Specification:
part of a larger assembly, 4 chains, A alpha+beta, B mainly beta, C mainly beta, D mainly beta, C: mainly beta, Structural Genomics Hypothetical 15.5 Kd Protein In mrcA-pckA Intergenic Region, Chain A, OB fold (Dihydrolipoamide Acetyltransferase, E2P), 3 domains, 5-stranded antiparallel sheet, 19 strands, D: mainly beta, 5-stranded mixed beta barrel, 1 helix, 3% helix, RNA-binding, NA-bd_OB-fold (chain D), RNA binding (chain D), Small ribosomal subunit protein uS17 (chain D), acetylation (chain D), ribonucleoprotein (chain D)
Chain lengths: 205, 50, 262, 151
RNA sequence: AAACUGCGAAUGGCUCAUUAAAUCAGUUAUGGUUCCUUUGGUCGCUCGUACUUGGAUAACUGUGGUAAUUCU
RNA sequence: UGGUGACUCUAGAUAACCUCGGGCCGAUCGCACGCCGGCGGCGACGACCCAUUCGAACGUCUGCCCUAUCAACUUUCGAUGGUAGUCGCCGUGCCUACCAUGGUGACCACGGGUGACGGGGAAUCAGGGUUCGAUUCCGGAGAGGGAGCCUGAGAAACGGCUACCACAUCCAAGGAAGGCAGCAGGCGCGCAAAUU
RNA sequence: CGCUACUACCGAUUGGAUGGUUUAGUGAGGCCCUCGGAUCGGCCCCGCCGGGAGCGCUGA
């Protein structure tokens, strides 16, 4: 029976407002969708006009975009690490819009290696499992190898992104409203936005 | 307590007025959609599962 | 209050229907359709109050369910179907075609047209928009969606529509010097040549129209409907040619006609 | 100054700022394009909005508001809110029985963009009507004209 | 006839208790939204048993319970 | 591509996603005629999307009676604004978290009173005005008082449901059933208003 | 000053009725969420030749 009406509020002058009508159906509100990280659970809501809203109650997968490389991937949502609105929303690990999440980087790592030899970090270490060295070296005709060689020119990943890829988790921002559309979609944090949010997360501790 | 007993195979039905508590003892504390051997209702009822 | 209303009081009806005040409490509530509630002539008003083929609404229903009436070439059995400006009403049984047109008093006159002119109509395009993989669509004043219009056709232009196929035959641009009629406001029903359109960005444009008798008036841009290229209308006009008379001139004409007639 | 004075990163949603960089194209700073639009009705975009760094989603020129409806005017009387100012619209109301007028006024809370520096009490502001921006704000300052006494 | 399905039942009618920039009136806006119905349009634009698929349930028949209901 | 005064519009391209409570891409129905293992003309109904037909909901501007024996009010429990979000059909302190200390007022705020629903309008009126407007048209509100919902495009619906409060009906005392400010008609109230 | 009547205030006693605001609890009922899983289904193992049994899995 919660309501979003303006007539229960005080006036700009500050005086009380006496209601002339009781609560209307079109003025209703609904309980918040405190979308938690977990196996996909989405409840549909019949809304005004006969349309539907997708109240996502549990999500562990989101379509996040690496915008510098124009690479949108479906990824596992691992953690919630920063919320600008409420710090309770990070303790409870609630997925809302503009909340900062830790997502997986493995599909971004696959697209990373498909444009082979993005910035060299630790690639000469005591590691190299079989069956994926082909995606890095391969037997390529001279034209395709030259194409990869010229792709090497645009192999520039920010140092912070490199540390995140080493950690296996990318910082990302959820640009969707999980409690309204049923998806937790967003974009990988990079640039001054990434620096700002890293500073904020560090200063929270 | 009366018993409205039906036989689906011939689609027949009959109402039996049962007054003795001993016969109905086997029905008490049993929920709906439960199989019970209704041999306590008489000799002709022996072997019937309702 | 809750949901749409379904009735229309007799006195709250549009005044151009020329309904009575003692013939019931209710007026025919026009159905939803191509034209607005207050800018339409319901089929019952046309077939009963104007043409007098029916004395009651039941007789209008009897006439309409025999499929004798066609609006824009399509048989309509809804006796409250909203018929509005430029609509062609054809009765093949009695073999007559009318075009719903405005009189200088702002009322839908009973304007008979030839079978050859009943094959088409004029529509003011209300919007043009590119949609659905790049196809230009054009919406008209009668809610007729036409795909692939001529790229020259813009908003406020007039298009001649062939009623059988619903496709554009020709078009008149909205421009100074073009004949037009007024479809709303005080000057409703008047016909004249556009002389000047003065633009008000963020507000309503005002168009000035000069009569064929020299009289000049103004309307809002939404109330203009281009009728012909230059001063020749593309459609037949009522007994009056869009020239609104003053009350003195109308009184003199009436007196002279009665003197010379009986 | 530093526009990141909030708990969330402040940015124009239209502008994509972390495009892939180039070492030779680096000249000390990454460079940032500015999103601005011209509101209609012949109002010029201030040089501040085009070449500023402030983030204000309710700015008519760099935000997400549209100017539609009434264009009004008033004199600035309060500047004690964040990006909002209280202007006073004065008028005369006609009382017919006495064939006379009475001075009336009302105060409008209007959004003021950071693109308008050096706005003072008593300055005249042309404001444009937009969607509800807050509980009481429905107008956005489009132009500022200085008071004659300013020096 | 019934019964299932579909639509309507949110209109109309009554009353004036509440309600003091509230309702309301004129004026504008939705470039900040929803829209059954009518009308016009879209409706092989998916590139991997169809010569027609499945299970129910009403109505109906039959057995009933309650003092009592448009109960079942 | 197209458009507006103005889009973060329309259209286009790319990389993905595509809700078990899953989005469309007809397993529907009547009439009439035909020439080798095939076609087909009129309709009815239904589904998606667009177009606002009909609205609804929210905003803008200006206008409302008496009262100061009501002069300061609002701000803890949002009061004014900012940022992020939640919710909603959407804009919005609508709500939440954080932040700022704002916002209204003798141009009468705030409070109180009203045998105050508002207006079109009515009576009176030389001119100006005074009083009335429950009442058939438009808009609002309510269905004994509150509150919460289902269904649905649309209701916080009451000749729908669910409670409590008041009143009240039948009962075999276990239970069941209510809502005339609809049309008539009773009671009551009154100076005061008609046919079951 | 007497002195029948009439209207109005302040009141010890809060003597009785009708109302509306509020602290503190308590709180029906619906809605939402997290559980629950009566019961009903098919998929799992067989005959008869037409050619009624399990928190095994799954859906309501």
């Amino acid at each position: 029976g919660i309501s979003r009406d303006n007539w229960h509020k005080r006036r700009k002058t500050g005086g009380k407002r006496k209601p002339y009508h009781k609560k209307r159906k079109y003025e209703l509100g609904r309980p918040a969708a405190n979308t938690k990280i977990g196996p996909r659970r989405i409840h549909t809501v019949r809304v005004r006009g006969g349309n539907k809203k997708y109240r996502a109650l549990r999500l562990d997968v989101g379509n996040f975009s690496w915008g510098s490389e124009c690479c949108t991937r479906k990824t596992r949502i691992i953690d919630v690490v920063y919320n600008a609105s409420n710090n309770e929303l990070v303790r409870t690990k609630t997925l809302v819009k503009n909340c900062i999440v830790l997502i997986d980087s493995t599909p971004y790592r696959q697209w990373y290696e498909s444009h082979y030899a993005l910035p060299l970090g630790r690639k000469k270490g005591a590691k190299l499992t079989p069956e994926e060295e082909e995606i890095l070296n391969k037997k390529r005709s001279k034209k395709i190898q030259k194409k990869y060689d010229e792709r090497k020119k645009n192999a520039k990943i920010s140092s912070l992104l490199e540390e995140q890829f080493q950690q296996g988790k990318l910082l990302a921002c959820i640009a969707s409203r999980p409690g309204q559309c049923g998806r937790a979609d967003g974009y990988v944090l990079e640039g001054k936005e990434l620096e700002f949010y890293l500073r904020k997360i560090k200063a929270r501790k | 307590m009366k018993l409205n007993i039906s036989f689906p195979a011939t689609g027949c039905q009959k109402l039996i007025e049962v007054d003795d508590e001993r016969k109905l003892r086997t029905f008490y504390e049993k929920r709906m959609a439960t199989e019970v051997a209704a041999d306590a209702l008489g000799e002709e009822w022996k072997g019937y599962v309702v | 209050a809750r949901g749409p209303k379904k009735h229309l009081k007799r006195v709250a009806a549009p005044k151009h229907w020329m309904l009575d005040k003692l013939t019931g409490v209710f007026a025919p509530r026009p159905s939803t359709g191509p034209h607005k509630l207050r800018e339409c002539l319901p089929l019952i008003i046309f077939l009963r109050n104007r043409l007098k083929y029916a004395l009651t609404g039941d007789e209008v229903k009897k006439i309409c369910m025999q499929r004798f009436i066609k609006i824009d070439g399509k048989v309509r059995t809804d006796i409250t179907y909203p018929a509005g400006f430029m609509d062609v009403i054809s009765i093949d049984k009695t073999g007559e075609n009318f075009r719903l047109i405005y009189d200088t008093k702002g009322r839908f006159a009973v304007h008979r047209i030839t079978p050859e002119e009943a094959k088409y109509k004029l529509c003011k395009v209300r919007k043009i928009f590119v949609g659905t993989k790049g196809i230009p669509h054009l919406v008209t004043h009668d809610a007729r969606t036409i795909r692939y219009p001529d790229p020259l056709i813009k908003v406020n232009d007039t298009i001649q529509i062939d009623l059988e196929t619903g496709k554009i035959t020709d078009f008149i641009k909205f421009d100074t010097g073009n004949l037009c009629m007024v479809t709303g406001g005080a000057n409703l029903g008047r016909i004249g040549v556009i002389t000047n359109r003065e633009r008000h960005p963020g507000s309503f444009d005002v168009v000035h129209v000069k009569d064929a008798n020299g009289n000049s008036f103004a309307t809002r841009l939404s109330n203009i409907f281009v009728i012909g290229k230059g001063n020749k209308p593309w459609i037949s006009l009522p007994r009056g040619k869009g020239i609104r008379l003053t009350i003195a001139e109308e009184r003199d004409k009436r007196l002279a006609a009665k003197q010379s007639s009986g | 100054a530093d526009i990141q004075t909030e708990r969330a990163y402040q940015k124009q949603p239209t502008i994509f700022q972390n495009k892939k960089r180039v070492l030779l194209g680096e000249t000390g700073k990454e460079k940032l394009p500015r999103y601005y639009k011209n509101i209609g009705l012949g109002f010029k975009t201030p040089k501040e909005a085009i070449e500023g760094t402030y983030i204000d989603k309710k700015c008519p020129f760099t935000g997400n508001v549209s100017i539609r409806g009434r264009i009004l005017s008033g004199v600035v009387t309060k500047m004690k809110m964040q990006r909002t100012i209280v202007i006073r619209r004065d008028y005369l109301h006609y009382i017919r029985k006495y064939n006379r007028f009475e001075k009336r006024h009302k105060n409008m809370s209007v959004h003021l963009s950071p693109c308008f520096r050096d706005v003072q009490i008593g300055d005249i502001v042309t404001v444009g009507e937009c969607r509800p921006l807050s509980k009481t704000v429905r107008f956005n300052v489009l132009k500022v004209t200085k008071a004659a006494g300013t020096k």
